Every structure is written in C-alpha cells, then in structure tokens.
Design a protein around this ligand. Structure first.
Ligand code: FMN
Ligand code: SF4
Lengths: 62, 129, 432
C-alpha cells in the first residue's frame, strides 16, 4: 500500500514492477498464483502482469 | 465537326438488336454497378478504384460424371470495368440491361495521434505496447 | 587566455569530492563537503536564472547523448496546463563500461538529491523519479537513506529548504533490463508496462510518465547541477574545449594496469588520461590494440588514432566514434577483437526489447554473422553483407539501441577488415 501510494492516483498499474518484486522476496521465485495475486491487488489484467514478468530478467518465473 | 448532312438522332442509343444477345439474356438479367469492396484479408485499396459491372448468379449444378460446376448462364464470368459510374450506367442503358447502382463507399477520414496512447486523463491510454 | 592542453584537473575544482567513499556519505559529511549549502538562495532566485546559468555553463548531456542540458531543461519552462510536471533521473547504468552512476549514488547521494531539487525547481516539476536499476539494491538503499535524512532535515518535501517549493524524490527500482536506460522505455517501465521505447513524434516535454510532462536527465548532470549553480556557469565553462566544457567521470577498464574511475576535465588527451589516472595499458602503450571510448554504443578506435585524440564529443566525432558515457575499454594485442565485438553484439541481442523489426530481427542476424566470423566460417562477401545489414539497422529503429548495436560492427569492420579476412582464410585452409 505504501508503494501504491508512491504513485499518482488513477495510475496504480505503475506499481506493478515493485509489487511483483515483493512477491519475489517472500517467495524466492514467482509462481503463477503470485502473478494472479499481483494482478488482483493491483486491479490490472493478468496478461499485463505476465508480460512484465516474462520481459524483465530479474523475475524468476521458475 | 462532321459535314455530311449531320442528322439529329436525339432518341436514346440502343444496340440491343446489334449485339447478338438472345431474348432470354437481355431483360431477365440484372447487372450491378458497384465499386468492389477491399478484401478484408489484405490491407491494400488498389482494387477499390474502378467501377465494375456484373450479372446475377444463376443455377450451378454438379456434373453427374465427375462433379464439375456445370452451368448454363453464358454471362456468369463476364465482368466489365469502368472508370466512372456514369460511364458504367451509360453502357448498361446502351445495351438495355436493368441495373441497380450502389454508391462508392469511402473510408471516413479518421484522426490518429500517437500521444493519445499515453494520455493522462482519458481512457485511450493503452495498457500494453 | 585559452587553455590548449585541457587536462590535469585540480582537486579544488571537482564536482564530486567523495568518489571512493573516503568521507561520510550521510547528510553530515555532505554538509562538511559543501553539499546542501545555500540551496534556499538558488531555490528563490528563479527557474529562469537556473536554466540560464546551466546554458552558460555549457553542460552537455552526460548520460550518453550530447544534447545541451540547458536547452533540454528549458524545454519545460512552459506555463502550467493542469497536468503535473515530472523530473526523472536515469540511473539504469546498463551500458557496458559504465561505472560512474553507481559510485555517485552509493558515495554522494545527497548531491543527487540536491540535483533533483534544483532541477525540479528550474523546470517546475512537482516530484522526482530516480529510476535505479534492480541490481543496485545496496546503492538504492543508500540513496533512500540519504533521501530520508534530507526529508527529516526539511531540505526536501513540503516547503523544501523553506523556499515554499514542494518537491518529492521517489526512487523506482528497475528489474534488470538495459533497454530501460532509454528515456521513453524508462518512462513506460515506470508506468508499469514493459521497457519498450516509445516513438517520439511526441516528446517527453509534452507527454511523459503517466501522460504528464516528464524530463529524463542523467545522474551525473543532475548531480553537478547544484554545483553548477553554486560555483557558477563560467567556472564550469573554463574547463574543457569550447562547446565541450565541464568535467566527466571517466571509467577506465579493459586491459589497463589499474582500472579505476576519475573525475577529469573534458577534451583531455586519451594517452595522458590512460597513463596517469589508469596507470597505462598493460605492457605499455605499444601493447595497445584498440580502445572503446565511451561504452559499447561508441565504435572502437585503433591505437594509431588513440595516440592523439582529445576526449571531447567533437574530437571523437571527428574520429568516427562518439564520447558516449566516457567508458574507456582498452584491449591489448593479446585480445581477440572479433571475439570481443561478437560478445558486445551478443549483449545487444540479449538486451533488445524486440519492439521494432530492425532491432528484433537485425541484431540477432548480426549476432549469428559475428559468431560465424569468430570461427571464420564465412567468405569475404559477408563482411560487406554485414556492413549493409548494419546500415539497414541504422536510422530505422524506434530507439537508439539499434544504432548502438550497429556502430560496433561498423567500427570493427572499418578498422579490422584484414583480421577478419585472415581468420577466414585460416579457417578455409584448416577445413581442407
Ligand atoms: C539503449 C540505451 C540505453 C541508455 N542507457 C542509459 C543509461 O543507462 N543512463 C543514462 O543516463 N542514459 C542512458 N541512455 C540515454 C537516455 O535515453 C537519454 O538520452 C538521457 O538519459 C537523457 O539525459 P542526458 O541528456 O543528461 O544524457 C540510454 C539510451 C539508449 C538508447
Ligand atoms: S531498437 Fe531494439 S530495443 Fe529499441 S525499440 Fe527497437 S527492438 Fe526495442
């Protein structure tokens, strides 16, 4: 919620990259359930989360 | 112009008796003046710049021996091209063919803008690239 | 009157005084080193004054381009339009050979914070988004510690330094992409989408992050900006050649005896900088095969040219290369130049975002061609074929990564065609 607050109102999707990173820290890797949970908590379509996860290297999908 | 006792022939031109077309194939047919629509499979409009005249499709049965598309309509694969609608209708009336001209549809000029993809207040902001 | 041999910068006139963490990097040490001093006067002087003094200083973009920082920053001096205004500091630092930004972030973060403050006031921005790369976790944490110290001290935030200005410095972390260094790609990466660069019929001054006007600067230029305001534009203008003023953090590496980072004045002799600050090339200057001046994007240059080349933008432009990010990469005679350039092309292929066709397909093709070249599995015609492919990539991509991948190939061909020819001949004779 602090990370989301660090962005302009109405553009919560900007928090997708850090929020997903948080899902990494408490899980080591990123399961698809974490992907969908990030999508839910960020009110963003799951496909965009999948895209940003597969694009950037640091996100461990396995 | 033409000095040979140039005669007034005001009545409309008609060569229905000078074409050899049989009785059946000159009024029971209905030509169609139209600008062909762009093939939605492609994205090129070079085939939508010339008017075309075509005849109504008729019976097309299967050949008993092999199964070909047998037909008995001579004016089935004959499609004329025309630079303008008026010339096409002039040809249709000249040959005595009933027509139904469709106006040429034109893509309405849109308003494209790259910036709208990344708008700040509007809903046109894209969620992906 | 006018200095001829631009070099040997003095310790007194150096923007960054804590390169190697020899002094306290917190607020106390920064104030001890002249940082965060008389900032209120700069804040109250007026954005136009700051922009004019930046133009007078002649500061050019120290992030890889060469655009005048004054003109780019004054592009935001337009009146308000309801939309907020944003300053963004690029700290991706993905270009190979670059080491300056990491050093300034983890050793002089308060200079960076004051730079965001003064820049945002000059351009009317409401907040700053320092986009550090994901790998620099310790550096980002140090930067945020300095940010918290400044926030507690009241230098930033509501009533920044008591001048009535309200500024914020958020630090968005990257996620491991070199293309995120591109300003428009950085903008989308901040916005939450992938790091694909945006086309530029619209410019960041008009449409940037979240659609609001944004301006992307580099860590180095914003860091030197408060010093530019304090010491003065003419003081910066004194150093370096004309239109090539200022001091730069040169990152020296490769086959140098003592690879390092030094703050040296512009238009410096390459030989002198290599010899003194870096310690010379391993095996002496005679053992030098090639020099990459400013990172992977800048084409390499051979030793014969390296003998006498000034380190300003224009001098290297005349040398059929670019200053880029002042990333000196020296390669000795024991270096397989083909192998090194192929590795650079492999890096670019691995870092291409794949948006536009010339970079997505072309760079991979150049990678395959160079992989065959390293083993000499080709014929003389494919050298010209590779040159043509590199030209086709150039000037046809959305961002400059395509050109930054094509330039190394052009430089390698132009300066070592005989090496490729002879390696190919050796492979041909061996395969008999
Ligand atoms: C592929 C690519 C990578 C870049 N990486 C960086 C980078 O790591 N740091 C940086 O400051 N600028 C980088 N840039 C340059 C920026 O896109 C932009 O031109 C610059 O940051 C603007 O600020 P400046 O004028 O102070 O350099 C990169 C550009 C490209 C095309
Ligand atoms: S040049 Fe490469 S990185 Fe740049 S937009 Fe095109 S595909 Fe993406």
């Amino acid at each position: 919620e602090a990370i989301v607050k660090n962005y302009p109102e109405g553009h919560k999707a900007a928090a997708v990259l850090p929020v997903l990173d948080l899902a990494q820290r408490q899980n080591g890797w990123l399961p698809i359930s974490a992907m969908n949970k990030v999508a839910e908590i960020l009110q963003v379509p799951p496909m965009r989360v999948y895209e940003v996860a597969t694009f950037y290297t640091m996100y461990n999908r396995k | 112009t033409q000095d040979t006792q140039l005669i007034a022939v005001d009545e409309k031109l008609d060569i229905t008796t000078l074409t050899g077309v049989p009785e059946e194939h000159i009024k029971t047919r209905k030509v169609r003046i139209f600008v062909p629509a762009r093939n939605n499979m492609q994205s090129g409009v070079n085939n939508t710049k010339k008017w075309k005249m075509e005849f109504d499709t008729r019976e097309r049965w299967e050949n008993p021996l092999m199964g070909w598309s047998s037909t008995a309509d001579p004016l089935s694969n004959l499609v004329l091209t025309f630079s303008t609608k008026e010339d096409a209708v002039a040809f249709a009336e000249k040959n005595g063919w009933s027509f139904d001209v469709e106006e040429r549809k034109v893509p309405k000029p849109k308003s494209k803008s790259y910036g709208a993809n990344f708008s700040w207040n509007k809903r046109t902001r894209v969620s992906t690239k | 009157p006018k200095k001829t041999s631009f070099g040997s910068l003095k310790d007194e006139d150096r923007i960054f005084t804590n390169l190697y963490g020899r002094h306290d990097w917190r607020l106390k040490g920064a104030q001890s080193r002249g940082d965060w001093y008389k900032t209120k006067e700069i804040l109250l002087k007026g954005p136009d004054w700051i922009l004019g003094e930046v133009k007078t200083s002649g500061l050019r973009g120290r992030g890889g381009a060469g655009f005048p920082t004054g003109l780019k920053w004054s592009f935001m001096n337009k009146p308000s339009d309801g939309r907020p205004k944003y300053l963004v500091v690029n700290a991706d630092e993905g270009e190979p050979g670059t080491c300056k930004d990491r050093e300034i972030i983890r050793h002089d973060p308060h200079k960076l914070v004051e730079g965001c403050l003064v820049g945002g006031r000059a351009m009317g921005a409401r907040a700053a988004y320092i986009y550090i790369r994901g790998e620099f976790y310790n550096e980002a944490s140090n930067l945020q510690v300095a940010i918290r110290e400044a926030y507690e001290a009241g230098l930033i935030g509501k009533n920044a330094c008591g001048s009535g200005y309200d500024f914020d410095v958020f630090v968005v972390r990257g996620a491991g992409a070199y293309i995120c260094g591109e300003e428009t790609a950085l903008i989308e990466s901040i916005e939450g989408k992938q790091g694909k660069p945006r086309l530029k019929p619209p410019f960041p001054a008009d449409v940037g992050v979240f659609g609001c006007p944004t301006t992307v600067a580099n860590v180095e230029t914003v860091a030197v900006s408060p010093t530019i305001c304090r010491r003065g534009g003419a003081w910066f203008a004194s150093f370096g050649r004309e239109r090539n003023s200022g001091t730069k953090l040169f990152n020296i590496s490769g086959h140098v005896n003592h690879p390092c980072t030094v703050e040296e004045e512009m238009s410096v002799p390459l030989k002198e900088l290599i010899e003194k600050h870096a310690g010379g090339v391993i095996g002496g200057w005679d053992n030098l095969l090639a020099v990459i001046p400013g990172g992977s994007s800048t084409p390499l240059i051979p030793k014969s040219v390296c003998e006498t080349v000034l380190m300003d933008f224009d001098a290297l432009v005349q040398a059929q290369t670019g200053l880029g990010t002042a990333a000196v990469i020296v390669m000795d005679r024991s270096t397989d130049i083909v192998k090194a350039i192929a590795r650079l092309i492999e890096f670019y292929k691995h870092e291409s975002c794949g948006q536009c066709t010339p970079c997505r397909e072309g760079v991979d093709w150049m990678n395959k061609v160079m992989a065959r070249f390293v083993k000499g599995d080709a014929r003389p015609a494919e050298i010209d074929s590779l040159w043509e492919i590199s030209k086709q990539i150039e000037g046809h991509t959305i961002c400059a990564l395509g050109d930054g991948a094509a330039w190394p190939v052009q430089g390698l061909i132009r300066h070592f065609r005989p090496e490729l020819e002879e390696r190919m001949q050796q492979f041909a004779l061996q395969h008999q």
